[PDB]
C-alpha cells in the first residue's frame, strides 16, 4: 500500500457528524454508505494506487437483452469512472448484445449460456447486478470491500418481523422472526472475487439442498443471499441510494442521490 500524496480537503470534525438522520455504521462496525459519509477523492486515490480492477456481472436472458444498451451506456457515465472495469455479460443471445462505446481501461466480455479461475486472474472485485436498471448518479469505489450487500428500498424502514425472509424451517434460507439485521436486495451485491465465490458456492449448495428436499425459497436467490449475509456479516452495507425505484417510491428526503434505479 503506497503513500497518499498531499491533499487539501475540509477537516472531518469529531463532534459534528455528517449525517444525523441515518445509521452510518452497523453494530459489527461495517460502514453503511450514504451520501455525505465519504470523500470520494481520498477513496479514489486509495483504490487507484492499488490499480484496482472492478468486474461488473449481469445476466441478460430472453427479453432482458433489451435492457443492455441503457444499462451499459449509463454504467459508462456513472460506474467506477477513472478505474479499470471489466463487464461480464451472460446471455443466450450473443448477437443481440449492443455495440456500446467504452471509455479507456474498460472492456466487455460476452459469455454465452466455469468462470472462477478467470475472475481471480482478471479482476480484484466482483459486482453482481440486475440488468433491468440504469445508473443515474455516481457509483464508485466507496462500495468496494471484501463483502457487501444493499438495503432493499421497500424494507430499509421496516422492523425485522416484516422482512420477507424465508420463514419455513424446512428451507436452508430459514430465518426466524427474532433474527435479522436488514433485508438485502438480490439485485446488487459484491465484494472481492474470493468472497463472492464463497458466497455463491454457499448459495448454490443451499439451493441444491432445498431442491432435493422439494422446497423453493419464497424469494429464490435473494432469500439465500439474506441467510448468508445474516451468518457472514458484510464489511459494508450500501444504502437505498444504490438500489431505488423512483416510480414506486418517489424521492424521499433521506435520499440525497438516486444512483442506480429500476427501469419501467
Which CATH number covers residue 251? 3.90.550.10
Q: Which residues of 121-154 are buried (b: 16+ CB within 10 A; e: fewer)?
A: ebbbbbbbbbbbbbbbbbbbbbbbbebbbbbbbb
Catalytic residue among 142, 166, 195, 222: 222
Q: Which of 259, 262, 253, 228 is nearest to 19 (CA)?
A: 253
181 Cβ partners below 8 Å, 6+ apart?
Answer: 26, 27, 160, 229, 230, 233
Handedness of CA 119, 122, 125, 126 (dihedral sign): negative
In units of Å, what resolution does this entry have?
A: 2.1
Q: Is 25 strand, coil or helix?
A: strand
Residue 132 backbone dihedrals phi, psi, to 5 degrees: -80, 60
Domain that holds residue 123: 1-264
Residue for cell digits 453494530? 27
Residues comprising the binding site? 59-61, 64, 130-132, 152, 164, 222, 245
Outline where DSSP puts E strands in the chain: 32-33, 53-60, 84-91, 106-112, 125-129, 133-135, 147-150, 188-192, 236-238, 260-262
Q: CA dist 18 to 39, 213, 237, 238, 250, Å?
A: 11, 49, 17, 17, 24
Phi, psi of 3 (to 5 degrees): -65, 135
Cα–Cα distance measured from residue 174 to residue 126, given in angstroms and rounded to the nearest whole number? 26
Residue burial 32-64, b: 16+ Cβ < 10 Å; e: rest = bbbbebbeeeeebbebeeeebbbbbbbbbeeeb
Q: In the chain, count H helices and then E strands.
A: 6, 10
Number of domains in the chain: 1
The dihedral region occupied by 192, where left means phi > 0, alpha psi between -120 and 50, and beta the remainder, is: beta
Task: Say whether 222 is catalytic.
Answer: yes
Amino acid at each position: 500500500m503506497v503513500s497518499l500524496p498531499r491533499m487539501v480537503y475540509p477537516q472531518p470534525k469529531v463532534l459534528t457528524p455528517c449525517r444525523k438522520d441515518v445509521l452510518v455504521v452497523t453494530p459489527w462496525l461495517a460502514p453503511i454508505v450514504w451520501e455525505g459519509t465519504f470523500n470520494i477523492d481520498i477513496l479514489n486515490e486509495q483504490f487507484r494506487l492499488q490499480n484496482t480492477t472492478i468486474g461488473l456481472t449481469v445476466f441478460a436472458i430472453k427479453k432482458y437483452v433489451a435492457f443492455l444498451k441503457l444499462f451499459l451506456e449509463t454504467a459508462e457515465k456513472h460506474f467506477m469512472v477513472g478505474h479499470r472495469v471489466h463487464y461480464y455479460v451472460f446471455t443466450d443471445q450473443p448477437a443481440a448484445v449492443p455495440r456500446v462505446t467504452l471509455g479507456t481501461g474498460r472492456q466487455l466480455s460476452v459469455l454465452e449460456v466455469f468462470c472462477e479461475r478467470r475472475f481471480l486472474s482478471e479482476v480484484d472485485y466482483l459486482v453482481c447486478v440486475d440488468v433491468d436498471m440504469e445508473f443515474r448518479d455516481h457509483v464508485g469505489v466507496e462500495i468496494l470491500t471484501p463483502l457487501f450487500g444493499t438495503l432493499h428500498p421497500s424494507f430499509y424502514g421496516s422492523s425485522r418481523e416484516a422482512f420477507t425472509y424465508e420463514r419455513r424451517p424446512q428451507s436452508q434460507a430459514y430465518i426466524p422472526k427474532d433474527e435479522g439485521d436488514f433485508y438485502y436486495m438480490g439485485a446488487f451485491f459484491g465484494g472481492s472475487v474470493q468472497e463472492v465465490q464463497r458466497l455463491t458456492r454457499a448459495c448454490h449448495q443451499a439451493m441444491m439442498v432445498d431442491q432435493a428436499n422439494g422446497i423453493e425459497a419464497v424469494w429464490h436467490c435473494e432469500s439465500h443471499l439474506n441467510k448468508y449475509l445474516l451468518r457472514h456479516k458484510p464489511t459494508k452495507v450500501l444504502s437505498p441510494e444504490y438500489l431505488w425505484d423512483q416510480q414506486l417510491l418517489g424521492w424521499p428526503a433521506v435520499l440525497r442521490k438516486l444512483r442506480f434505479t429500476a427501469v419501467p
